């Protein structure tokens, strides 16, 4: 019911948001290839049941529904993707320091989401007066089996590969 912004938001938010989603959709598969190639066996072969889009607590998104509804769900996804990639980048730097291309393409993906976060959270605030949203975060991978740390990060980039195409398909 209450929302206020100091200064106005960026012009053409829906164009920026859709340009942000379409940019993430392009680099989605390249980050998928870069990941499992750095993990080695048995990931580039059993890429189906180890690196698939099966992620349990991943937030939902329905293509139907109003622009406010499609944007609050997108807010929870981008928050979920932010904590995971921050964890996965931490996990990978200990396991795989050799692949410095996977690190730089994980920092890129992380920063595009945070720029997309202001576009989504403001548009809720400036137009629908959302103010604040309660979100959920992913599981912490700080102390887990190395294979599970590798496998959890695999399934995330697989689900992210499939969910980002849905988001880029909608909106406009």
């Amino acid at each position, epitope marked *: 019911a209450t929302c206020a912004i100091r200064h*106005p938001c960026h012009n053409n938010l829906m164009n920026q948001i859709r340009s942000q989603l379409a940019q993430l959709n392009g680099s989605a598969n390249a980050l998928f290839i870069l990941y499992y190639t750095a993990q080695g066996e048995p990931f580039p072969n059993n890429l189906d049941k180890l690196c698939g889009p099966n992620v349990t607590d991943f937030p939902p998104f329905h293509a139907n529904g109003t622009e406010k509804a499609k944007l609050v769900e997108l807010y929870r996804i981008v928050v979920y993707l932010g904590t995971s990639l921050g964890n996965i980048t931490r996990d990978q730097k200990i396991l795989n320091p050799s692949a410095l291309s996977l690190h730089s393409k994980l920092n890129a993906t992380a920063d595009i989401l945070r*720029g997309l976060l202001s576009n989504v959270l403001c548009r809720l605030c400036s137009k629908y007066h959302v103010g604040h949203v309660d979100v959920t975060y992913g599981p912490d991978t700080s102390g887990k089996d190395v294979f599970q740390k590798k496998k959890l990060g695999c399934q995330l980039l697989g689900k992210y590969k499939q969910i980002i195409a849905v988001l880029a398909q909608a909106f406009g």
Partner: antibody
Framework: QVQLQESGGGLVKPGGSLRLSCAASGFTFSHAWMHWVRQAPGKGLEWVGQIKAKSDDYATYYAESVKGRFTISRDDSKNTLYLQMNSLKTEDTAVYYC?????????WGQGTMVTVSS | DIVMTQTPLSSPVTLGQPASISCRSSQSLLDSDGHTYLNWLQQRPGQPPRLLIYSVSNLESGVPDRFSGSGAGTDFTLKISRVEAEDVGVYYCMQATHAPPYTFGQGTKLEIKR
């Protein structure tokens, strides 16, 4: 946390040249709109110009008082904001402020002094 | 071209007494989206400008509730219900609707009696 620190001020002869640098840390720089604002000794506040991100193709806008003579740059890889001022005049003697104007946050730097005299 | 005119200071406000500053614009600040992009800044001596009240009446975190915001269209008012020795400074008002360019007021210096 969030910090903005300018650097590049000093003494520059009239009709000269100068390049200021504002280094940021604490927020997402590749998405923030950055502005420059100056305050002449014993005067008010005057907006100088802004710059945007890569989505807007780093679009710049300038106040008519400095248009054609000041140039705003940004290096997203270093989180650094620039202001290349050529053809300086004695009116430009002011404290130049680095500021970030956004719905998320409003933050002003500490300012650096540019003095134009012979 | 937008101009921002402020009523200057009439006398040093005695400690604890209220104070009123007002900005008056040349054109309406109500935008098409429904928001009125009018801010209020404060510059303590030696310090850079900081934001007090944004979008007419909404306070900034870390600013005491003595400050109040009000106004509509072209007329606005800054309200301090009690004056303490930290409020001495210059107050500006900034618009962001018809932008660029962004414009400020000349500034209302506040003095205190004791």
């Amino acid at each position: 946390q969030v910090q903005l620190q300018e650097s590049g001020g000093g003494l520059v002869k009239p009709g000269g040249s100068l390049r200021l640098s504002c280094a940021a840390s604490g927020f997402t720089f590749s998405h923030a709109w950055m502005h420059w604002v100056r305050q002449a000794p014993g005067k008010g506040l005057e907006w100088v110009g802004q710059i945007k991100a890569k989505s807007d193709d780093y679009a710049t806008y300038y106040a008519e008082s400095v248009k054609g003579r000041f140039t705003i740059s940004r290096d997203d890889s270093k989180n650094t904001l620039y202001l290349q001022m050529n053809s300086l005049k004695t009116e430009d003697t002011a404290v130049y402020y680095c500021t970030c104007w956004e719905w998320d946050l409003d933050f002003w730097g500490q300012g650096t002094m540019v003095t134009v005299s012979s | 071209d937008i101009v921002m005119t402020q009523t200057p200071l009439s006398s040093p406000v005695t400690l604890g007494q209220p104070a009123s500053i007002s900005c008056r614009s040349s054109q309406s600040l109500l935008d098409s989206d429904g928001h009125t992009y009018l801010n209020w800044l404060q510059q303590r001596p030696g310090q850079p400008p900081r934001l007090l009240i944004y979008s007419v009446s909404n306070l900034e975190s870390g600013v005491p509730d003595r400050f109040s915001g009000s106004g509509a269209g072209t007329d606005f008012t800054l309200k301090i219900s009690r004056v303490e020795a930290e409020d001495v400074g210059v107050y500006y008002c900034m618009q962001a609707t018809h932008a660029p360019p962004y414009t400020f007021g000349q500034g209302t210096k506040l003095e205190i009696k004791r």
